[PDB]
Amino acid sequence: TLSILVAHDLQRVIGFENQLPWHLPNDLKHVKKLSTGHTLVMGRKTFESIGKPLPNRRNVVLTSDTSFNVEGVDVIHSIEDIYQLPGHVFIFGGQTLFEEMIDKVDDMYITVIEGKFRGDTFFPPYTFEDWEVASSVEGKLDEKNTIPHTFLHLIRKAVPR
Ligand SMILES: NC(=O)c1ccc[n+]([C@@H]2O[C@H](COP(=O)([O-])OP(=O)(O)OC[C@H]3O[C@@H](n4cnc5c(N)ncnc54)[C@H](OP(=O)(O)O)[C@@H]3O)[C@@H](O)[C@H]2O)c1
Ligand SMILES: CCC[C@H]1c2ccccc2C=NN1C(=O)/C=C/c1cc(Cc2cnc(N)nc2N)cc(OC)c1OC
After folding, report:
1. Residues in a beta bridge with 109
2. Top-tier CATH class for 1-161
3. 42, β-bridge pairs
4. Ligand 2 center–CA 20 separation, angstroms
5. What are the sequence ranges of the domains in the chain?
6. Which residues take part in binding substrate?
7. In what order do the strands lie in the sheet with 58-62?
8. Whose CA is nearest to atom 5 of ligand 2?
9. Would you say 148 and 33 are in contact if contact means Cβ atoms under 8 Å apart?
């Protein structure tokens, strides 16, 4: 399976100055739960932002840098390399990867952050006309998680007739 994994706000902002614009621990727990034991594919900037590989799953970084070498990270140099990756693969970001992959993935795990943040990077537009809502679950609010948010699992609709 090839899936997108992303958090975007009401205007599809996903990032600002190479960081997530929001502080929302529950979404990172969501990410952890979904991707543990599987594979993350991310652009070089997204990797450098996180700073190191995330434990207990395969970290794959897409970059044109042939000198790129990071312990615990596997490197690829073209989109076509993604399709050779075994198992469940999650497109992890950032803007560039999402734009390149949104027309190619089976499904998307989207956390909608129900707010409006200042951003400099965005998820591509999409329409629910193309995507079935396999599930929609409101995130729980509390002390450490103060921004309303919704976990969507979207599956690409088949065009029939
Ligand atoms: N909210 C979310 O869910 C979420 C998801 C992840 C990241 N973010 C964010 O997204 C932002 C950054 O996105 P971004 O687009 O600027 O950077 P990015 O997608 O993370 O990575 C950019 C880079 O990946 C490369 N790359 C992409 N396609 C390639 C290809 N076909 N062949 C070879 N290399 C390729 C390049 O590396 P080289 O330049 O080294 O060649 C490139 O400059 C940040 O602000 C960050 O916080 C948010
Ligand atoms: C609960 C522990 C948190 C932790 C972790 C620890 C150990 C093992 C696995 C993981 C799983 N990922 N974890 C992270 O800190 C990742 C954070 C992160 C992520 C994303 C991507 C992302 C963000 N959000 C969404 N929905 N899609 C996404 N694709 C982007 C980031 O910066 C730009 C991140 O850094 C803040």
Report:
1. 5, 153
2. alpha beta
3. 61, 93
4. 9
5. 1-161
6. 5-6, 27, 49, 57, 92
7. 73-76, 58-62, 39-43, 89-93, 2-9, 107-113, 149-156, 131-138
8. 32
9. no
